[PDB]
């Protein structure tokens, strides 16, 4: 394995991650309806949880990537020549199956990266982050070159352009995966493992439960429907959550530098750090309830989402890096991997529970009156 | 890359005592648990003793009460003390590291092995 093949493998893994998260990033960017995001998250978490326990075949990854591509094609054709009711029904079922397929693809790619030397999990995560950044950048570039016709609440030209970009990325990732990857071929009981590393599980569910509680439907959906935020400004608001969330997962990794010495601190301090994250709930609600000019400001709205974005990824990698320090009775190498399975499961429950509790705020009269 | 340096092996009489030093240079803080593995000639690899980052002590059932392994987080060096050596422990001990690569939403672990030292006891 010389430098050329290693570089190609790193590139194809980064590209697999990028093309897997492209669909979610463009669904966020296009201001799609909230229930579609909820369906996508539900499908993704269900598929990931199911695939964690079942050793699904590793040959099927290109097939489901092609299924994702044809689903994007169906999205385009439905936005083109389908009426509102059939478009809604399609888009919802397509988003459910898209979430399922994306979760399966992520699981298969991570399993491929793990069972090989010079792991590519870091490369896949970097690919996901670059997917978020790339979607934001192309959306910003595309905003001033597309007329906002707003056919079904989604810009026709923007949807077509973003989805053809996603399709070309998906097919070129397909060819990269086919060319590069080879698709031929005494432990303690779980109760003791759970009762020992319970803080790490709880500290990871809480951060993902709260972040996905707000950003989907209250992070920018309720702000724009209560303050009439322009579509140009919404892209900056939503698109800067996905550029600071990716940038926030690195500083924990470069702990050797003096500046980032205190970024990974402890597990006990993480619970009290997630309690301070609960102070984001009044701030997000206050941004959609007061007309006083400071709250109706693009920079404040951007910064308020930026702070949540930074504390999301930074608090999502810390429990992975410090939970081994807090372990007392789980000492074997096999239990370390088993506990890590509980952590990723605890996140998907956090994402699944995060989206659905957004409907709690529907009871409150948060949104300002139209006149 | 990640490099491991081991020293202390040799030929000593039965019931002796040796101190094995293992140090890491490439990865500084991502190491979670370091340990020692022995491989007898004509035999498969086996675990000897591992110390985690949170001072968690693991041992093989055949070395309990005889081997003491200590860590020095200041320079990322792990030392193993062997007491009352016996002929069946004649093997090659290779230091091992356990690095977590967890850039987010997925934790993956790697094993880094040094060249190891040959320890033989006879007479």
Numbering used by the authors:
A (entry chain A): 30 to 214, 228 to 413
B (entry chain B): 1 to 123
Published text:
P. falciparum nucleoside transporter 1 (PfENT1, encoded by PF3D7_1347200), located predominantly in the parasite plasma membrane (PPM), is the primary nucleoside transporter mediating nucleoside uptake from erythrocytes. Crucially, PfENT1, a member of equilibrative nucleoside transporters (ENT, SLC29) family, shares only 17% sequence identity with the human equilibrative nucleoside transporter ENT1 (hENT1) and is unsusceptible to hENT1 inhibitors, which provides an opportunity to design inhibitors targeting PfENT1 specifically. The overall structure of PfENT1 contains eleven transmembrane (TM) helixes with pseudosymmetry. Here, we report three cryo-EM structures of PfENT1 in the apo, inosine-bound, and inhibitor-bound states at a resolution of 3.3 Å, 3.1 Å, and 4 Å, respectively.
Therefore, we generated two nanobodies, Nb19 and Nb48, to enlarge the particle size and create a soluble region. CDR loops 1 and 2 of both nanobodies interact with the intracellular surface of the carboxyl domain of PfENT1. In contrast, the third CDR loops insert into the central cavities of PfENT1. The two structures of PfENT1 present identical inward open conformations with r.m.s.d. value at 0.398 Å. In the inward-open state of PfENT1, the occluded extracellular gate is stabilized by extensive polar interactions. Asn60, His262, and Gln266 forming a hydrogen-bond network are conserved in plasmodium ENTs.
